[PDB]
Amino acid sequence: MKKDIHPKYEEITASCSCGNVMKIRSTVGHDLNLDVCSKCHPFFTGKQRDVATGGRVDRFNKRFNI
């Protein structure tokens, strides 16, 4: 490129708390250990939990213990 006007680029290997470790090229300087990556973030199971609202007569029905 422009011959040393750009930041450093090193093949680091970033790690995750739930596995998910890969060989990456980035300008960081230390392999940061982050939380769930794309392989574990709940956008495949959490879709069920995405519709978290529903049921008000349910609330009425549960209060009716009489």
């Binding site: 008000r56 007569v57 609330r59 009425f60 209060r63 213990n65």
Partner: protein, 79 residues
């Protein structure tokens, strides 16, 4: 805020609702029972409730079941 057991409803307003679901949707029910809560079998009705001087009609919605009819009828008018 109400009781541990036995939610509250006036008898006359309970009877009018049972007569409603028996006879289906009908003309608005005029009641003064601002204290009686809402039951699920009142949803779809257009019951009118007192505000001290007039019966303001309220169309019961799925959400308004844990509340009381007077909660949807203001009493004092401001501006």
């Amino acid at each position: 805020r109400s009781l541990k057991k036995g939610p509250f409803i006036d008898l006359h307003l309970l009877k009018k609702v049972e007569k409603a679901v028996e006879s289906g949707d009908k003309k608005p029910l005029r009641t003064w029972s601002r204290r009686s809560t809402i039951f699920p079998n009142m949803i779809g009705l257009t019951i009118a409730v007192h505000n001290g001087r007039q019966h303001v009609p309220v169309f019961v919605t799925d959400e308004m079941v844990g509340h009381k009819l007077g909660e949807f009828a203001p009493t004092r008018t401001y501006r």
